[PDB]
Amino acid sequence: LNDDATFWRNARHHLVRYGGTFEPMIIERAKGSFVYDADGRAILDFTSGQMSAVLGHCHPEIVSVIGEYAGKLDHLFSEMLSRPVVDLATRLANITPPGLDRALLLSTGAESNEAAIRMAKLVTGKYEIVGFAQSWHGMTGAAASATYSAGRKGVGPAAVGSFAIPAPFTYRPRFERNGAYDYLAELDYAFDLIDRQSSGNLAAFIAEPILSSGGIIELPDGYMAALKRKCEARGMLLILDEAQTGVGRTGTMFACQRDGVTPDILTLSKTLGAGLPLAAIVTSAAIEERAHELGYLFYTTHVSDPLPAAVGLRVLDVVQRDGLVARANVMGDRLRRGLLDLMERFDCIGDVRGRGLLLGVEIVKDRRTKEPADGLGAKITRECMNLGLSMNIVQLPGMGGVFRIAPPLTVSEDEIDLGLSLLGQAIERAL
Amino acid sequence: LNDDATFWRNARHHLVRYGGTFEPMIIERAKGSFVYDADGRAILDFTSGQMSAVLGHCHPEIVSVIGEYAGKLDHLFSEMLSRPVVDLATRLANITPPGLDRALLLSTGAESNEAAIRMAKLVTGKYEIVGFAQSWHGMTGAAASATYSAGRKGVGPAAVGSFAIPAPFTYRPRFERNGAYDYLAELDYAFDLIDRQSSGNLAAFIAEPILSSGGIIELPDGYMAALKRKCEARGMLLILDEAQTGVGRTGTMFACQRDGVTPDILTLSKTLGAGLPLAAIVTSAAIEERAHELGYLFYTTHVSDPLPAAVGLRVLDVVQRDGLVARANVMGDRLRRGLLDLMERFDCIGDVRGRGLLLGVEIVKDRRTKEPADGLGAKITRECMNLGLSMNIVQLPGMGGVFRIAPPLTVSEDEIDLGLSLLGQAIERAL
Amino acid sequence: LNDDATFWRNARHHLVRYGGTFEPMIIERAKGSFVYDADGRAILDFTSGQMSAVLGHCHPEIVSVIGEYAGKLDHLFSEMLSRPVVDLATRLANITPPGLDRALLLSTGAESNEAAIRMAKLVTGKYEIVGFAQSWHGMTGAAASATYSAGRKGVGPAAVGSFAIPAPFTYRPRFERNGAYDYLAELDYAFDLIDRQSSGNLAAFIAEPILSSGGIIELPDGYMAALKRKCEARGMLLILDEAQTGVGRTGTMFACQRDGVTPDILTLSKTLGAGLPLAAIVTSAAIEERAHELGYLFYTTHVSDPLPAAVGLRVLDVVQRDGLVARANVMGDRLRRGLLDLMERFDCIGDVRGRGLLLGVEIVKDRRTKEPADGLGAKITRECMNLGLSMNIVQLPGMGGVFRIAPPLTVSEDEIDLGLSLLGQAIERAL
Amino acid sequence: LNDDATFWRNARHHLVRYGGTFEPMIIERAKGSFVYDADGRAILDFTSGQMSAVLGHCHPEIVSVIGEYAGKLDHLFSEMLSRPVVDLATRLANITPPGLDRALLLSTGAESNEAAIRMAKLVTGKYEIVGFAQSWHGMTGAAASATYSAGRKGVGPAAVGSFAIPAPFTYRPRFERNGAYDYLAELDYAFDLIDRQSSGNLAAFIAEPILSSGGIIELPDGYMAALKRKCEARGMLLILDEAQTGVGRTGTMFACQRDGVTPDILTLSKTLGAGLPLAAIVTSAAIEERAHELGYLFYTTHVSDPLPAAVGLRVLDVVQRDGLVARANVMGDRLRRGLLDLMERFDCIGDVRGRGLLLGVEIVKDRRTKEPADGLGAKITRECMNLGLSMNIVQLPGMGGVFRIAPPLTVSEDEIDLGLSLLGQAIERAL
Ligand SMILES: Cc1ncc(COP(=O)(O)O)c(/C=N/C2(P(=O)(O)O)CCCC2)c1O
Ligand SMILES: Cc1ncc(COP(=O)(O)O)c(/C=N/C2(P(=O)(O)O)CCCC2)c1O
Ligand SMILES: Cc1ncc(COP(=O)(O)O)c(/C=N/C2(P(=O)(O)O)CCCC2)c1O
Ligand SMILES: Cc1ncc(COP(=O)(O)O)c(/C=N/C2(P(=O)(O)O)CCCC2)c1O
Ligand SMILES: [K+]
Ligand SMILES: [K+]
Ligand SMILES: [K+]
Ligand SMILES: [K+]
Ligand code: NA
Ligand code: NA
Ligand code: NA
Ligand code: NA
D19 located within any domain: no
Q: What is the 3-state secondary structure (H, E, C) of chain B?
A: CCCCHHHHHHHHHHECCCCCCCCCCCCCEEEECEEECCCCCEEEECCHHHHCCCCCECCHHHHHHHHHHHHHCCCCCCCCCCHHHHHHHHHHHHHCCCCCCEEEEECCHHHHHHHHHHHHHHHHCCCEEEEECCCCCCCCHHHHHCCCCCCCCCCCCCCCCEEEECCCCCCCCCCECCCCECHHHHHHHHHHHHHHHCCCCEEEEEECCEECCCCCEECCCCHHHHHHHHHHHHCCEEEEECCCCCCCCCCCCCHHHHHCCCCCEEEECCCCCECECCEEEEECHHHHHHHHHCCCCCCCCCCCCHHHHHHHHHHHHHHHHCCHHHHHHHHHHHHHHHHHHHHHHCCCEEEEEEECCEEEEEEEEECCCCEECCCHHHHHHHHHHHCCEECCEECCCCCCCEEEECCCCCCCHHHHHHHHHHHHHHHHHHC
Contact (CB<8Å) D200/B160: no
Exposure class string for A90-99: b at 16+ Cβ within 10 A, else e: bbbbebbbee
Chain D's closest residue to B158, CA to CA, is: D199
> Which one, of B81, B107, B59, B57, lies nearest residue A276 by Cα?
B107
C299 in contact with ligand 3, CB cutoff 6 A: yes
The residue out of A298, A322, A346 marking a domain boundary is A322
CA angle, residues B123, B125, B131, in degrees to nearest 5: 85
Give the number of the ligand closest to the Cα of residue C275.
Answer: 8
Residue A50 annotated to the active site: no
- Rounded to whole angstroms, the Cα distance separating C252 from A118 reads 53
Q: Which of C322, C352, C371 is the last residue of a domain?
A: C322
Distances (CA, A) of B135 to A123, B202, D395: 25, 18, 36
Cα C416 off chain centre by: 21
For residue D31, the SS3 value is: strand
φ/ψ bin of D61: left (φ > 0), alpha (ψ from -120 to 50), beta (otherwise): alpha
State which H helix or E strand residue D393 sits in. strand D393-394
Nearest CB partner across the interface for D193, out of B133, B178, B201: B133
- Residue closest to D156 by CA, chosen among A201, C214, C127: C127
List, as own/partner pairs, every contact residues B6-13 make where C-beta atoms lie below 8 angstroms and the sequence separation is at least 24, other chains included.
B7/A83, B7/A86, B10/A86, B10/A89, B10/A90, B11/A81, B11/A86, B11/A89, B13/A90, B13/A93, B13/A101, B13/A102, B13/A285
Distance CA D126, CA D201 (A): 5
In a domain, A4, yes or no: no
Ligand 1 centroid–CA B136 distance in Å is 7
DSSP 3-state of D362: strand
For this PDB entry, the determination method is: X-ray
Q: Which of C1, C18, C305, C316 to mutate to test the interface with D (most CBs of D within 10 A)?
A: C18
User: Most C CBs within 10 Å: which of A130, A193, A198, A211, as the mutation test of the C interface?
Assistant: A193
Cα angle for residues C145, C163, D198 (degrees, 5° grid): 55
Chain A residues lying within 8 Å of B108, measured CB to CB: 107-108, 111, 277, 300-302
For ligand 4, atom 2, the nearest C-alpha belongs to: C137
Q: Report the phi/psi class of residue B209: left, alpha or beta, with left for phi > 0 and alpha for psi in -120 to 50.
A: alpha
Three-state DSSP string of chain A: CCCCHHHHHHHHHHECCCCCCCCCCCCCEEEECEEECCCCCEEEECCHHHHCCCCCECCHHHHHHHHHHHHHCCCCCCCCCCHHHHHHHHHHHHHCCCCCCEEEEECCHHHHHHHHHHHHHHHHCCCEEEEECCCCCCCCHHHHHCCCCCCCCCCCCCCCCEEEECCCCCCCCCCECCCCECHHHHHHHHHHHHHHHCCCCEEEEEECCEECCCCCEECCCCHHHHHHHHHHHHCCEEEEECCCCCCCCCCCCCHHHHHCCCCCEEEECCCCCECECCEEEEECHHHHHHHHHCCCCCCCCCCCCHHHHHHHHHHHHHHHHCCHHHHHHHHHHHHHHHHHHHHHHCCCEEEEEEECCEEEEEEEEECCCCEECCCHHHHHHHHHHHCCEECCEECCCCCCCEEEECCCCCCCHHHHHHHHHHHHHHHHHHC
Q: Are C414 and C426 in a shared domain? A: yes
Q: Tell me which chain B residues have a C-beta less than 8 angstroms from the C-beta of A154.
A: 121-122, 125, 294-295
How far, in Å, from the CA of D83 to the mean position of ligand 7?
29
Question: Which residue in the set A66, A72, A276 is minimally distant from B29, CB to CB?
Answer: A72
Taking CB atoms and an 8 Å limit, are B398 and D192 in contact across chains? yes
Alpha helices in D96-171 (DSSP H): 109-124, 141-145
User: D379 with D262, same domain?
Assistant: no
* Rounded-to-integer distance, Cα D91 and Cα D69, Å: 19
- Residue C343 to residue C331: CA distance in whole angstroms: 18
HSE-CB at B29 with a 13 A cutoff on CA atoms is 10
Out of D20, D90, D108, name the one closest to residue C79 (CB): D20
Question: Across-strand partners of D366?
Answer: D371
Instruction: Give the end-to-end CA distance of chain A in Å, rounded to a whole number.
Output: 30
- Distances in Å between the Cα of D242 and the Cα atoms of B375, C390, D267 are 48, 37, 6
Beta carbons of C380 and C426 less than 8 angstroms apart = yes
CA angle B202, B207, B209 (to 5 degrees): 150
Catalogue the active-site residues of B: 136, 208, 241, 244, 270, 404
> D429 Cβ partners below 8 Å, 6+ apart?
D383
Of the candidates B326, B321, B328, B323, the residue with the CA atom closest to the CA atom of residue B409: B328
Pick the residue from chain C with its C-alpha nearest to D109: C301
Same domain, C334 and C345: yes
- Select from D301, D322, D343 the last residue of a domain: D322
If asked whether residues D169 and D264 sit together in one domain, one would say yes
For residue B135, give the ligand 1 atom closest to its CA: 1
A8 lies in some domain? no
Same domain, D80 and D219: yes
Q: Which ligand is in closest contact with the Cα of A108? A: 2
Report CA-CA distances (Å) from D134 to B229, C142, D189, D206.
25, 22, 18, 12
CA C265 to CA C103: how far, in whole Å?
10
Give A135's contacts (C-beta < 8 A, 6+ positions apart). A146, A147, A148, A149, A164, A167, A206, A207, A208, A211, A213, A214, A241
HSE of C32 in the Cβ direction (CA atoms, 13 Å)?
A: 8
Backbone torsions φ then ψ of C98, nearest 5 degrees: -80, 130
Residues of D in contact with B179 (CB under 8 A): 178-179
Query: Residue A83 maps to which CATH number?
Result: 3.40.640.10
Q: Which residues contact D231 (CB under 8 A, 6 or more apart)?
A: D204, D205, D237, D238, D264
C339: domain CATH number is 3.90.1150.10
Q: Searching chain C, which residue's CA lies closest to the CA of residue D406?
A: C77
The rounded Cα D7 to chain-centroid distance in angstroms is 31
CA distance B162 to chain D (A): 8
C280 and C364 together in one domain:
no
Q: Which residues surround ligand 11, an ion (CB under 5 A)?
A: C 93, 96, 100
D206 DSSP β-pair partners: D239
Angle at Cα A419 formed by Cα A417 and Cα A424, nearest 5°? 95
Q: Which ligand is nearest to the CA of C19?
A: 4
Nearest to C106 by CA among C97, C95, C117: C117
SS (H, E, C) chain C: CCCCHHHHHHHHHHECCCCCCCCCCCCCEEEECEEECCCCCEEEECCHHHHCCCCCECCHHHHHHHHHHHHHCCCCCCCCCCHHHHHHHHHHHHHCCCCCCEEEEECCHHHHHHHHHHHHHHHHCCCEEEEECCCCCCCCHHHHHCCCCCCCCCCCCCCCCEEEECCCCCCCCCCECCCCECHHHHHHHHHHHHHHHCCCCEEEEEECCEECCCCCEECCCCHHHHHHHHHHHHCCEEEEECCCCCCCCCCCCCHHHHHCCCCCEEEECCCCCECECCEEEEECHHHHHHHHHCCCCCCCCCCCCHHHHHHHHHHHHHHHHCCHHHHHHHHHHHHHHHHHHHHHHCCCEEEEEEECCEEEEEEEEECCCCEECCCHHHHHHHHHHHCCEECCEECCCCCCCEEEECCCCCCCHHHHHHHHHHHHHHHHHHC
User: Which among A389, A356, A232, A303 has a CA at the least distance from the CA of A88?
Assistant: A303
- Give the residue, by CA position, lying nearest to ligand 2 atom 7: A109
Å from CA of C13 to ligand 4 middle: 27
Contacts of C among chains (3+ CB pairs under 8 A): A, D
The H or E element spanning position D336 is helix D324-345
Residue D15 included in any domain: no
Does residue A338 lie within any of the structural domains?
A: yes
Interface test with B, best of D153, D169, D193 (most B CBs within 10 A): D193
Indicate whether A237 and A344 sit together in one domain.
no
Name subunits touching D (3+ CB pairs < 8 A). Answer: B, C
Residues of B in contact with D189 (CB under 8 A): 174-175
Q: How far is the CA of D291 from the centre of ligand 4 (A)?
A: 21
Domain membership flag for residue B5 = no
Choose the mutation target among B66, B301, B385 for the interface with A, i.e. most A CBs under 10 Å.
B301
CB C108 within 8 A of CB C269: yes
Do B152 and D128 touch, CB atoms closer than 8 A? no
Number of domains present in the structure of chain A: 2
DSSP for residue D261: -
Q: What are phi and psi of C208, to 5 degrees?
A: -90, 135
Whether the Cβ atoms of residue C90 and residue C343 lie closer than 8 Å to each other: no
Residue pair C55/C318 in contact by the 8 Å Cβ criterion? yes
Domain residues for D76?
59-322
**Nearest residue to A263 via CA among A233, A295, A232, A290:** A232
Neighboring chains of B (3 or more beta-carbon pairs < 8 A) = A, D
C-alpha span between A426 and A201 (Å, rounded): 50
Cα→Cα distances C79→A30, C304, D44, Å: 75, 8, 15
Q: Is B210:B354 a contact under the CB 8 Å cutoff? A: yes
Catalytic residue among A121, A234, A314, A404: A404
Q: Of the candidates A399, A364, A376, A340, which has an alpha carbon nearest to the alpha carbon of residue A170?
A: A399
**Strand bridging mode C42-45 / C389-390:** parallel
Distance from CA of A323 to the nearest CA of B (A): 23
Which backbone phi and psi does A414 adopt, to 5 degrees?
A: -75, -30
In the reported structure, the alpha carbon of residue B322 is separated from the centroid of ligand 10 by a whole-number distance in angstroms of 21
B164–D133 CB contact, under 8 Å: no
Main-chain phi, psi angles of C198, to 5 degrees: -45, 150
DSSP D167: P
CA–centroid distance for D103 within its chain: 19
Q: Which of D48, D49, D240, D208 is nearest to D136 (CA)?
A: D208
Q: Using an 8 Å Cβ cutoff, are B164 and B130 in contact?
A: yes
Q: Round to whole Å and give the CA distance between D58 and C95.
A: 31
Same domain, D94 and D205: yes
For D141, name the nearest residue in chain C, comparing CA atoms only. C141
> What ligand is nearest to the CA atom of residue A82?
5
Task: From the CA of A245, give the closest atom in ligand 2.
Answer: 1
Cβ–Cβ < 8 Å for C155, C227? no
Q: Using CA atoms, how far apart are residues B406 and D365, in angstroms rounded to an integer?
A: 56
- Cα-based distances in Å from D53 to B99, C308, D271, D409: 61, 15, 6, 8
Q: Which of A33, A95, A77 is nearest to A315 (CA)?
A: A95
Asked whether residue C347 falls in the same domain as residue C307, the answer is no
Nearest to D107 by CA among D289, D299, D266, D250: D299
Put the strands of the sheet holding C202-207 in their side by side order. C102-106, C279-283, C265-268, C237-241, C202-207, C128-132, C162-165
Asked whether the beta carbons of residue A127 and residue B157 sit closer than 8 angstroms, the reply is yes
**B201-to-A313, B130, B160, C200 alpha-carbon distances in Å:** 46, 11, 11, 16
Give the residue among D376, D274, D375, D382 at the shortest CA–CA distance from D23.
Answer: D382
- What is the distance in angstroms between the Cα of B188 and the nearest Cα belonging to chain A? 26
Query: Nearest C-alpha to atom 21 of ligand 4 is from which residue?
Result: D300
Determine the Cα–Cα distance for residues A35 and A25; give it in Å rounded to an integer.
11
How far apart CA C100 and CA C79 sit, in angstroms, is: 23
C18 domain residue, yes or no: no
Cβ <8 Å between B47 and A18? no
Q: How far is the CA of B166 from the centre of ligand 8 (A)?
A: 49
Q: Could you tell me how far CA D181 lies from the centroid of its own chain?
A: 26
Q: Whose CA is nearest to atom 10 of ligand 3?
A: C301
Question: Tell me, what amino acid is at C241?
Answer: D
Q: Which ligand is nearest to the CA of A47?
A: 2
Residues B291, B349, single domain; the answer is no
Tell me, what amino acid is at D164?
Answer: A
Burial of C419 (0-12, 13-18, 19+ CB in 10 A): buried
Residue C166 lies in a domain: yes
Closest CB to A164 among C148, C197, C201? C197
Domain co-membership, B167 together with B297: yes
Q: Which of D93, D145, D159 sits opposite C13 (nearest CB)?
A: D93
Q: Which residues contact C107 (CB under 8 A, 6 or more apart)?
A: C277, C278, C279, C300, C302, C303, C308, D107, D108, D277
| Cα–Cα distance for residue pair A38/B237, rounded to 1 Å | 39
Contact between chains at A28 and B127 (C-beta distance less than 8 A): no
CA angle C210, C214, C217 (to 5 degrees): 35
- Output the CA torsion sign for C51, C56, C58, C62: negative
B328 and B280 in a common domain: no
DSSP class of D373: P
Q: Edge-to-edge strand order for the sheet containing A42-45?
A: A29-31, A34-36, A42-45, A389-390
Strand order from edge to edge, sheet including A162-165: A102-106, A279-283, A265-268, A237-241, A202-207, A128-132, A162-165
Burial class (CB in 10 A: 0-12, 13-18, 19+), A229: middle
Best mutation site among A269, A272, A359, A394 for ligand 2, i.e. most ligand atoms within 8 A of its Cβ? Answer: A269
Enumerate residues 6+ apart whose C-beta is below 8 A from A427.
A342, A346, A348, A349, A380, A383
